[PDB]
Design a binder for these strands. Sequence first.
DNA 1: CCTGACTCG
DNA 2: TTCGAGTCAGG
Length: 579
Amino acid sequence: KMAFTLADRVTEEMLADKAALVVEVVEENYHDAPIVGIAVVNEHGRFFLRPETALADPQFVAWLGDETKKKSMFDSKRAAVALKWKGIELCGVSFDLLLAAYLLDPAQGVDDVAAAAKMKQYEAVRPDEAVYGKGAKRAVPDEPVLAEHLVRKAAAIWELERPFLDELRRNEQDRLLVELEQPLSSILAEMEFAGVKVDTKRLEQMGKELAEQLGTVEQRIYELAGQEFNINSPKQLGVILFEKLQLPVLKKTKTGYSTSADVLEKLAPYHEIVENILHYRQLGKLQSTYIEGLLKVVRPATKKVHTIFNQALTQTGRLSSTEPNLQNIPIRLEEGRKIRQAFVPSESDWLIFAADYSQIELRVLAHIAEDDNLMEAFRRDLDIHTKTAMDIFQVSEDEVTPNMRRQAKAVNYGIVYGISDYGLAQNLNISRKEAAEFIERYFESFPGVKRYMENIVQEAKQKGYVTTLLHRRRYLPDITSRNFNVRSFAERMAMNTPIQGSAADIIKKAMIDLNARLKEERLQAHLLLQVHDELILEAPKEEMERLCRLVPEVMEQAVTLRVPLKVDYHYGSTWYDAK
DNA sequence: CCTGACTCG
DNA sequence: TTCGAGTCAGG
């Protein structure tokens, strides 16, 4: 039972200086999406307002934009961005229930108020999916029903604020919420709304040339196979490779023969077709995802793409990026890398500026493990891959070949991801006996790291969770499973999450610090993207000199570790050229 | 819808 | 039998 006022005009008591606020955007992608209703709960009552009314009411808009009028919300970024597309500013958000729930336990996958309410046994609100339905049945219900849902969500936020803040504090996560994630949410809202401009003429031309090349590679594959088939079908491909051409079966999955890139690479001594097939699938992914998929989400009038950074999704503390994902744009092979030529500045005589942390996960490892030998390598800035090579190959620096260094690189990151000798041998296509020795030698060379890996798994067993530098947590209830596979997965998460998660913490704080500096110096430069360990900005060309100093300094100084942090940077006329 | 394959950190 | 994401085509 819950009384509320279904209001048809705004009143003074609706504008109190503390309220739970709901600004409901039901489309998953909130860019330029309709606002279907509004609810306010405060000391004076519970109210529902129509958007057309309240959003045209100068007093309500003033209240929204007034920083001293504090609002508690769930997913404030969604409301903030949807409001931006209507030219309205939302300020004063002092508590975000989505982010609070996310910090308390990312595993719960909270993405509606009812799901957060569940964490505190609060049942006086329905799941969104219950009210709106799913798939083709999805629809906004009749006003009375909508109104009650929005009011119940606001009522829930109102009552849940203190219980959530109280638990965050005993978890040592209250500052993580209010000083890191909540400020970052506003910064991400700005980035999403600004968007990134795309050179569609260039993308469309690339797509036309790619179609041509696909056709050619395709026919060559059929010629080598002696038959036509669907190359994009791992099932049909498997019949061609392992039945028709009788190539060895190196791996099976639950569904059948594996045709993974790793397997096809290993088959190259048997038949040249596998190299053609790998190329074809590369080209096809470029076409389908980064040409076609990208062109579908460009807003035709402004030629911008507006990603959504999911801030409350990953288990480690990272962001993700969707519709489109701008955190997986090709870079490692030159053919794919050219896609980046189509990401351009939003203004004339602006440039793209890209700054990345060098080896942040390995530096975080050095810090947390307190390994003398690894800390000293970074403190002296020795090449960490060449150093590991000297140890795992047992040679002097002058004897380290480029291939040995590449193998050591694989050992250095593999350790951070819990690699076994099997995985390392498969990765490097080397002897498993050898791979096991690489690992044995690594741990003899970096005994602090070995101790850290043992200790963190013990900590996980004892506490039930692991923590990052800035007190993010991930629970690991499988860490004591009797099942080898299940327990092993949890142990590798114990090892890896504090590293990936602490690196996430660091770059998040850098974004907040950087944004502060940019505004302080009245620079026009602004953030466009974050890609886990790098930040991409655009700015008028005049500001490059300043950014060359400002951006890396702010990023290097974000946190102080037991080793230095290092940032590299580049700028140019497109994302491609900022290299 | 899931699986597996390509993409990034 | 190396971690964490999103999108795509095929089935």
